[PDB]
Amino acid sequence: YIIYCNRRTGKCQRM
Numbered sequence: 001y002i003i004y005c006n007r008r009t010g011k012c013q014r015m
Contacts, residue, residue: 002013 001015003015005012
């Protein structure tokens, strides 16, 4: 699944 928040670039996950 997706458990990572790339807030750095402006992307996030759902988990």
